[PDB]
Amino acid sequence: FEGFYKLIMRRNSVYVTFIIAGAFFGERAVDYGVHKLWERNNVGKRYEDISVLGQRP
Amino acid sequence: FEGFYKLIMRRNSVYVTFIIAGAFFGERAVDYGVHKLWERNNVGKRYEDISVLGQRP
Amino acid sequence: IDIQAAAGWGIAAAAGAIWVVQPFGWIK
Amino acid sequence: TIDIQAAAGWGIAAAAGAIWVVQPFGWI
Amino acid sequence: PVKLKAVVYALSPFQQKIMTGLWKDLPEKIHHKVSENWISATLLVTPVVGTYWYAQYFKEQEKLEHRF
Amino acid sequence: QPVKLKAVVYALSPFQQKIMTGLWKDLPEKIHHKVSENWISATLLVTPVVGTYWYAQYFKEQEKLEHRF
Amino acid sequence: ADEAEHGLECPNYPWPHEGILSSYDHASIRRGHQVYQQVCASCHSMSLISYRDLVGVAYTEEEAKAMAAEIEVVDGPNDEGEMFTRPGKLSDRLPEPYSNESAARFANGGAYPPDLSLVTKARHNGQNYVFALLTGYRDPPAGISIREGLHYNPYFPGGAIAMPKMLNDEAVEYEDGTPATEAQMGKDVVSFLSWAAEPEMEERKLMGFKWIFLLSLALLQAAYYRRLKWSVLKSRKLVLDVVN
Amino acid sequence: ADEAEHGLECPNYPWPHEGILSSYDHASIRRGHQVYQQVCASCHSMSLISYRDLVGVAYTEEEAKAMAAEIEVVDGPNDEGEMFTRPGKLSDRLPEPYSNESAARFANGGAYPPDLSLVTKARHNGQNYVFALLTGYRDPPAGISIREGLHYNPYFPGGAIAMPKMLNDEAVEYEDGTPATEAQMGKDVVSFLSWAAEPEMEERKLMGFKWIFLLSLALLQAAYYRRLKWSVLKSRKLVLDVVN
Ligand code: HEM
Ligand code: HEM
């Protein structure tokens, strides 16, 4: 990991920015993955899958 | 006279009781004296000085 | 010096209780 | 001449954190 | 700690009069208070009083001018 | 009061050692050590709770049957 | 220009309750409440005042009980879930003349008669202002015209008030026989309004005189205690070697 | 007596919204709501639910807009000061069948049809109890008599409920053509009642899976950090002079 060390860990300002980006992108990726699992486990149960949606007299 | 007097300046327990008693009697006397002067300065303006007190119709 | 002080401080405590709480009428 | 680079490096971190706490993607 | 060389004589509080010093040398006390602070009192009172009277003078003239 | 001491201590850098492998090492003996030393303590804690709980369910079951016509 | 928008200043009147050792005139409060019942209460509400408040101040318990029982208070629901009316009790508040603010404005030309519970405290120089406003209905100065539905009153800001002159001679019959002149009724109702805004004044004033006197005595002791402790320092003689 | 006092225990049903990654069946929520507004709403209130709450859950915005417009909501007072009536809006709460609690008891033989906004959270085993109660109307056991006006339900504590049986076959007509059997309506209505008690559940469950997973990674890193800082202490060699 010394190649990555020489680029990110050398300065604490860069290391702090790396942590900020990792929290930003990492949380977005986990959020996307959780939503994919949520959709796959609940097929046909969402509000968008109501057959008579928009057809109330 | 001398019996209470010598106990007051010699024992703090007696002196504390003397302070408590003075606060009790001193405040009551002031409260009585203030009310007497209040009554003297407001003759005829009291609730029980109303002439028609007791005959609404 | 121990019994007399205990009696004196108990008397002050009782006087303080009668002074803070006024049980006039409860003395029946 | 490294205090200036320290300021620029920390300025990027402050900018990166600001876009991270407040995420104004719907405003830009 | 500061090294100090001094001799101090003190008298018991119960061997001296406690309150009569309040009204001793009263003319000197008043003269010292007035003579040392008359410039200070002037610098505080004059701008406040002068500004206050000018505003009342301004209001009186403005009020009279709008009358018929 | 500070303590006067005579010892020699040798220590190694944290970056020269494996950090996590020691948790899963001699696992069976940790399970042996935990069970063999603490089995009396676990008995004195679990037995009164289970014994009292079982007795209450036994009491309520016989009582419920006694009130049935 | 701006002389009218503030309105005419009110003079200072020697109210019987003014002074550090002065109480309310309880006979005047009872008369003032009668003025409220027959004149003010038609369009003014007193929602912070209840009939039990008058007991021991202007009426006895039985007098206030009978007075409350003469009104109808909305109560319920009953066991069937329907609202009903019942005679009032001591704990009931003074009745409201209108169902809501909108009903009050519609019945008064769009102006809302304010609640009079705290009116003497809710205006500058409240006791004097209310008396001057009540007895200050007069013809407008030359060059001033008043629109239809309003009345001129210099004490009211702007000079145009939506309330008519309500305090006319003999408008109320007093049970004590005092002549019910405009000034007598005006003085009495302000006295009643003053008590309603500050029902604790007599207790507050009595506490003030006693405790300011006691604290002044403690201040004399506090000065003596400070000077006694500091006397050993203030009378000290310090001998040093320095000269300049 | 002994066992009737607590009632018969409800079973455990496999609800579609049970599970760490399971959502509500939004088609069953819409079906359950139609049951409520056609059967339950005549005697039960849902005072915590608004028409805007159903938007994005079971109805479109215009579907709920039209729904609210069908009801008459008290409003006012107007400029003249009278309470009037207006069509309902999205922000309006669901209508109350009765004007107050006493009116509800009078219409139901002294029993109050409680608010159903949190009923599945206000009972032990809420979802299962409500479904079991609705579909659990049957004959009493031998030797047990019910008073007139009371109906036997073993799941109800005491066995005597003032509720009559209302989930009769074909009591409602579904928009999607689903056969409205008693068990089907009972499952839909609990699904709608479950959502009303916990409308945030879907967001809550998504948050839980996300953050419990993320914190588990932090726990693994926390152990490495602690064991890295302590390794210099735990692997150290200590030479001392004592033996015994
Ligand atoms: C003795 C009887 C009454 C007293 C003492 C009284 C007192 C007051 C007071 C203190 C004000 C407010 C003054 C201010 O805004 O600075 C007021 C306003 C008003 N009162 Fe009365 N009131 C009485 C009777 C009435 C009656 C009988 C009516 C109607 C028939 C009425 C209608 C109004 C209206 C409409 C206002 C609002 C005036 C405006 O906004 O310009 N009042 N009253
Ligand atoms: C599908 C329609 C309905 C559902 C799902 C429903 C739901 C419920 C629930 C959950 C309870 C609580 C039971 C308990 O407290 O243990 C209850 C009680 C009650 N319901 Fe409703 N309700 C419905 C319709 C009705 C109707 C139509 C009436 C009257 C005609 C009614 C009258 C009552 C009464 C009187 C009680 C209280 C009974 C008692 O406490 O003895 N309900 N209901």
Side-chain angles (χ1 to χ4, degrees):
Chain A
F1 286 80
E2 287 287 324
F4 184 79
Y5 174 87
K6 182 173 69 260
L7 209 86
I8 280 47
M9 297 296 180
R10 270 305 281 191
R11 300 288 182 268
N12 200 48
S13 37
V14 180
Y15 187 57
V16 156
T17 309
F18 166 71
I19 286 164
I20 278 156
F24 176 79
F25 286 122
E27 200 229 8
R28 288 286 88 226
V30 173
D31 186 348
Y32 170 85
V34 165
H35 182 62
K36 283 296 145 313
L37 274 158
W38 182 265
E39 280 176 308
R40 255 192 144 91
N41 201 50
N42 301 289
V43 162
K45 290 207 287 181
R46 339 184 313 248
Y47 158 88
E48 294 85 9
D49 306 87
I50 308 171
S51 64
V52 301
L53 193 58
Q55 303 162 354
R56 158 161 182 309
Chain B
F1 189 23
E2 289 178 350
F4 277 99
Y5 182 49
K6 259 71 158 312
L7 253 180
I8 293 169
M9 176 178 73
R10 175 186 26 143
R11 284 297 182 261
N12 198 44
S13 57
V14 174
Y15 181 76
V16 163
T17 309
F18 167 74
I19 293 307
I20 288 161
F24 171 64
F25 286 112
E27 197 221 68
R28 280 236 290 181
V30 166
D31 171 281
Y32 170 88
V34 166
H35 182 260
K36 283 311 145 287
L37 210 78
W38 172 272
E39 141 181 336
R40 171 241 172 220
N41 199 39
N42 305 295
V43 160
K45 307 197 305 168
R46 277 177 327 152
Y47 155 80
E48 37 259 83
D49 291 325
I50 298 170
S51 325
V52 300
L53 176 69
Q55 286 187 336
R56 212 176 48 89
Chain C
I1 211 55
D2 40 44
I3 294 309
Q4 312 129 9
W9 279 120
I11 284 195
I18 298 152
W19 166 64
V20 164
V21 184
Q22 318 250 259
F24 310 144
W26 176 82
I27 49 112
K28 295 314 122 51
Chain D
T1 65
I2 314 185
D3 259 12
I4 292 163
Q5 336 198 18
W10 281 122
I12 267 62
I19 312 167
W20 166 62
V21 188
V22 200
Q23 293 185 4
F25 310 136
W27 173 82
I28 307 150
Chain E
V2 42
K3 282 191 164 190
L4 188 61
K5 176 67 173 176
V7 176
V8 189
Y9 313 84
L11 186 57
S12 177
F14 306 123
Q15 293 290 134
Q16 28 192 332
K17 323 190 163 123
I18 300 308
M19 313 281 297
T20 54
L22 290 166
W23 48 83
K24 187 215 231 271
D25 67 292
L26 215 35
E28 217 182 284
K29 286 192 205 299
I30 302 208
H31 164 267
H32 287 84
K33 274 175 168 50
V34 171
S35 64
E36 287 172 40
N37 306 315
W38 71 268
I39 296 184
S40 292
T42 296
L43 281 169
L44 169 79
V45 170
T46 325
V48 176
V49 157
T51 302
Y52 187 90
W53 288 137
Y54 167 74
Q56 261 78 345
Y57 171 81
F58 191 100
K59 288 215 315 223
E60 199 80 50
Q61 306 306 108
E62 205 197 71
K63 152 143 89 53
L64 270 276
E65 197 262 22
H66 278 59
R67 310 259 267 260
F68 307 91
Chain F
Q1 150 75 32
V3 176
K4 270 210 172 181
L5 181 74
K6 180 75 164 71
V8 185
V9 190
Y10 310 86
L12 181 63
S13 199
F15 300 118
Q16 290 292 332
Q17 329 177 29
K18 279 134 135 64
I19 303 309
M20 318 283 305
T21 55
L23 290 155
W24 36 93
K25 175 229 292 249
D26 289 345
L27 268 193
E29 274 299 298
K30 281 148 173 186
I31 301 141
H32 169 268
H33 268 206
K34 282 196 159 60
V35 169
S36 55
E37 308 193 29
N38 301 325
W39 76 263
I40 296 180
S41 290
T43 294
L44 288 172
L45 166 71
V46 173
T47 290
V49 176
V50 172
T52 306
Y53 186 87
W54 156 88
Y55 172 71
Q57 316 313 290
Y58 172 89
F59 186 101
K60 99 206 172 303
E61 235 287 340
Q62 306 315 308
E63 201 71 74
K64 149 151 83 73
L65 287 161
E66 286 232 356
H67 293 351
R68 261 180 204 187
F69 311 101
Chain G
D2 52 1
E3 283 193 64
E5 57 143 50
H6 312 123
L8 184 56
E9 183 178 2
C10 39
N12 278 355
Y13 294 92
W15 296 101
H17 54 261
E18 253 275 332
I20 44 90
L21 266 169
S22 298
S23 94
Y24 289 119
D25 189 2
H26 281 274
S28 176
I29 291 175
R30 170 175 193 134
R31 277 199 307 273
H33 170 255
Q34 276 145 232
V35 170
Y36 168 78
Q37 250 180 345
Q38 330 189 0
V39 177
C40 326
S42 164
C43 326
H44 278 281
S45 67
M46 285 192 101
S47 315
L48 309 177
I49 315 299
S50 73
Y51 289 97
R52 76 177 151 81
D53 292 338
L54 303 168
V55 178
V57 169
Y59 299 90
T60 82
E61 194 163 289
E62 299 302 331
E63 291 190 288
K65 267 199 165 45
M67 200 168 354
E70 263 142 43
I71 86 188
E72 290 304 305
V73 189
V74 152
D75 203 26
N78 53 25
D79 281 346
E80 272 102 39
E82 311 266 19
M83 305 306 279
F84 60 91
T85 65
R86 53 135 175 110
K89 330 222 209 83
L90 279 187
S91 36
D92 293 322
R93 302 272 182 102
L94 262 49
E96 309 254 311
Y98 304 106
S99 307
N100 42 71
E101 172 155 320
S102 324
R105 276 184 209 271
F106 185 68
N108 281 277
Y112 170 67
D115 193 275
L116 294 183
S117 284
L118 311 161
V119 64
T120 51
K121 258 209 299 205
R123 310 269 192 276
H124 292 88
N125 210 15
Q127 282 93 336
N128 296 320
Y129 163 72
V130 172
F131 182 80
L133 173 96
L134 285 184
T135 62
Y137 283 89
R138 34 183 155 244
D139 301 77
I144 299 264
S145 78
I146 271 288
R147 74 89 146 150
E148 188 48 47
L150 303 184
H151 317 266
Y152 189 78
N153 205 308
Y155 305 96
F156 191 66
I161 194 151
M163 175 183 31
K165 183 178 179 180
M166 299 311 303
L167 279 198
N168 313 272
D169 289 345
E170 288 321 314
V172 176
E173 258 285 333
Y174 279 142
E175 42 178 358
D176 61 356
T178 53
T181 36
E182 170 221 79
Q184 191 50 59
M185 281 177 336
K187 161 167 145 52
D188 281 340
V189 80
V190 174
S191 177
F192 166 71
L193 286 179
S194 307
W195 163 85
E198 306 206 32
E200 87 301 323
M201 170 265 255
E202 293 184 18
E203 160 166 65
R204 157 167 59 86
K205 271 191 195 168
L206 272 172
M207 255 179 84
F209 192 92
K210 149 173 173 202
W211 284 111
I212 275 154
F213 165 80
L214 290 175
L215 283 172
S216 310
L217 293 185
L219 181 64
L220 285 176
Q221 186 256 30
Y224 176 90
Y225 193 25
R226 190 249 144 155
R227 289 181 66 82
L228 172 84
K229 278 282 186 289
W230 277 74
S231 56
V232 66
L233 282 171
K234 297 238 156 134
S235 311
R236 94 194 184 188
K237 170 189 231 258
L238 181 57
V239 176
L240 297 159
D241 294 323
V242 78
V243 169
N244 51 305
Chain H
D2 190 274
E3 306 172 50
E5 282 203 342
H6 315 286
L8 175 70
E9 63 185 342
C10 40
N12 250 17
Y13 292 93
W15 294 104
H17 44 98
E18 274 219 284
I20 59 148
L21 280 164
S22 278
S23 71
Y24 294 116
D25 192 357
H26 283 265
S28 168
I29 292 184
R30 183 202 198 91
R31 270 201 312 279
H33 169 254
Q34 304 175 224
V35 170
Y36 162 76
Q37 69 170 349
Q38 283 180 56
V39 198
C40 329
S42 64
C43 315
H44 281 273
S45 68
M46 280 199 102
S47 317
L48 293 180
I49 312 301
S50 277
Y51 287 108
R52 48 161 180 95
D53 291 314
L54 300 167
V55 179
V57 169
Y59 293 99
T60 65
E61 187 155 77
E62 290 280 323
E63 257 164 331
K65 260 183 199 103
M67 227 165 83
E70 313 218 324
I71 78 148
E72 273 265 309
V73 202
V74 184
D75 198 343
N78 44 37
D79 284 328
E80 306 203 4
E82 282 89 334
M83 295 324 264
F84 61 98
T85 61
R86 49 134 177 117
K89 330 208 288 273
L90 277 182
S91 54
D92 279 355
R93 298 281 173 94
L94 297 198
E96 307 271 317
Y98 305 108
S99 33
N100 58 75
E101 214 253 356
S102 289
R105 276 158 184 306
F106 180 61
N108 293 273
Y112 178 54
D115 195 1
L116 295 186
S117 288
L118 306 149
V119 58
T120 65
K121 269 207 302 181
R123 302 287 192 267
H124 292 100
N125 225 28
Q127 279 93 321
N128 297 307
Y129 165 69
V130 173
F131 182 83
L133 183 84
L134 291 173
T135 68
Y137 280 91
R138 37 184 170 237
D139 320 78
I144 280 141
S145 184
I146 303 301
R147 182 182 65 198
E148 208 173 62
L150 289 183
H151 317 261
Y152 189 76
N153 202 302
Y155 306 93
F156 193 66
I161 196 167
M163 213 190 223
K165 177 176 174 312
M166 329 283 321
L167 274 193
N168 297 280
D169 289 345
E170 274 85 76
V172 77
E173 167 111 359
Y174 281 139
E175 257 179 14
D176 37 348
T178 283
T181 72
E182 157 169 62
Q184 173 79 59
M185 299 178 291
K187 154 163 173 184
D188 291 319
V189 79
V190 186
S191 286
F192 160 74
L193 287 180
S194 300
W195 163 84
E198 302 139 277
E200 83 305 325
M201 170 264 246
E202 307 211 347
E203 148 187 32
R204 177 166 45 81
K205 279 191 183 175
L206 274 144
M207 254 189 99
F209 198 92
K210 175 193 186 155
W211 283 113
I212 283 152
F213 169 75
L214 280 193
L215 288 174
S216 292
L217 303 172
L219 185 58
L220 199 35
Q221 180 262 9
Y224 185 90
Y225 194 31
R226 188 251 155 163
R227 292 177 57 88
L228 180 75
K229 251 58 187 304
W230 276 80
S231 54
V232 67
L233 284 167
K234 292 219 175 178
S235 56
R236 92 195 156 151
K237 163 139 151 272
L238 171 64
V239 176
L240 290 159
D241 264 345
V242 76
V243 173
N244 49 296

